[PDB]
């Protein structure tokens, strides 16, 4: 039974900068080696066959080098739409067919910042007994950023939760979405709501609020 | 696509079930087939290989023959039937195949479909509009969305105009609340011009519930 070792596991890079994937065969496989490309939210597609040569509809920068052993991935002046996870495949062992662990590579962009949005629970949703109020945070960069909630200057813990996109495939940019859950009547109990973002990418913590 | 996978959303533990993958636009009777799968958090795993007359079959040690494969080349479907589940076998499978006469490597992979195992029963999604507020005038850019809420097992489909809208639309992650049910919003970044004049509709689908809506989202008066 082969072993597919792959460190590190996860990596980060500049755009327009290269980078090279370490791919490690247990059994010394004679050149015969396959390197997979996994973007977010898709299936993994093949780049590199008998670890040297590239795919028909493949872009010349993915490069395949080493041999036995040790393998190696190269991407050169990889674009936003390189974002993805990389494993390794290997088929000198045709009864087991083993992967690697994968590498995650992570790009770095220029800053950029949030644009950000409010939205009031529908009225919906009154009738279900429970109101969510949801923070939008569109297109920035890094992914480090401060959300709060406050209603009637209260900053608002244990009751909101924080979700982060995949870095994006055309801007390399992150999105977030505070929401905030509360009960109906708590929601009524309150007038105005409002939800302060800080970033790097602003010269000041920019809120945003409604009255209701 | 070219190999859709139609198979069980959620099961029972001890259980069967039994997933197809269907061939669309290439031959599928030269290439050999195989199951593979990969559990959340970027693990990739191969469970079995089937070979173009079924005359090679080959299973995962971790399998031991519990699964069985078979394919049919008159109606171009994969089958992966599965006799004894555990929770560890919670995956999503992919319809993968292979390369003629070059390589016993892989080249092309379905969409995958995720089967989730579980004691617990399903659960049908809550839909409501996360409608735009009026601002940025006429020059600036406003968001529209919809939130997902209490829905169990994963994945849902979400989708804006029947996929007429494909651009500036994030689907943020699924987050887990207190209550053990999964939560989702989804939204999108529209010109203020087109708001009033032109409509979006979000479609959500979750398969295991049977749960199909299309919902139309308009700013709020």
């Known amino acids: 039974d082969i072993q597919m070792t792959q460190s590190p596991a996860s990596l980060s890079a500049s755009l327009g900068e290269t980078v090279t994937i370490e791919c490690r065969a247990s059994e010394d496989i004679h050149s015969r080696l396959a390197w997979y490309q996994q973007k977010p939210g898709k299936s993994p597609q093949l780049l590199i066959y008998?670890?040297?040569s590239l795919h028909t509809g493949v872009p010349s920068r993915f490069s395949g080098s080493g041999s036995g052993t040790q393998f190696s991935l190269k991407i050169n002046s990889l674009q936003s739409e390189d974002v993805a996870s990389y494993f390794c495949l290997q088929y000198y062992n045709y009864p087991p067919y083993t992967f690697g662990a994968g590498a995650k590579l992570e790009l770095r962009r220029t800053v950029a910042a949030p644009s950000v949005f409010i939205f009031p629970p529908s009225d919906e949703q009154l009738k279900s007994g429970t109101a969510s109020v949801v923070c939008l945070l569109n297109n920035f960069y890094p992914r480090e950023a401060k959300v709060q909630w406050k209603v009637d200057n209260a900053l608002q813990s244990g009751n909101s939760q924080e979700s982060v996109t995949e870095q994006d495939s055309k801007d390399s940019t992150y999105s977030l979405s505070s929401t905030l859950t509360l009960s109906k009547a708590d929601y009524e109990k309150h007038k105005v709501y409002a939800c302060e973002v800080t970033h790097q990418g602003l010269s000041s913590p920019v809120t945003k609020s409604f009255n209701r | 696509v070219q190999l859709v996978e139609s198979g069980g959303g959620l099961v029972q533990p001890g259980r069967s079930l039994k997933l197809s993958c269907v061939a669309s636009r290439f031959t599928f009777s030269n290439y050999g087939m195989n199951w593979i799968r990969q559990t959340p958090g970027k693990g990739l795993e191969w469970v079995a290989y089937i070979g173009s007359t079924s005359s090679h079959i080959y299973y995962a040690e971790t399998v031991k023959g519990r699964f069985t494969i078979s394919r049919d080349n008159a109606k171009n479907t994969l089958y992966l039937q599965m006799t004894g589940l555990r929770s560890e076998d919670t995956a999503l499978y992919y319809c993968?195949?292979?390369?003629?006469?070059?390589?016993?490597?892989?080249?092309?992979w379905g969409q995958g479909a995720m089967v989730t195992v579980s004691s617990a029963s399903t659960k049908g999604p809550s839909v409501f509009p996360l409608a735009p507020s009026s601002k940025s005038t006429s020059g600036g850019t406003a968001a529209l969305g919809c939130l997902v809420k209490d829905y169990f097992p994963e994945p849902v489909t979400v989708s804006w105009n029947s996929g007429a809208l494909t651009s500036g639309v994030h689907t943020f992650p699924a987050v887990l609340q207190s209550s053990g049910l999964y939560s989702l919003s989804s939204v999108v970044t529209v010109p203020s011009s087109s708001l009033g004049t032109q409509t979006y509709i979000c479609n959500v689908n979750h398969k295991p519930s049977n749960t199909k809506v299309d919902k139309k989202v308009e700013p709020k008066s």
């Open positions: 008998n670890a040297n």
């Open positions: 993968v195949g292979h390369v003629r006469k070059l390589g016993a490597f892989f080249d092309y």
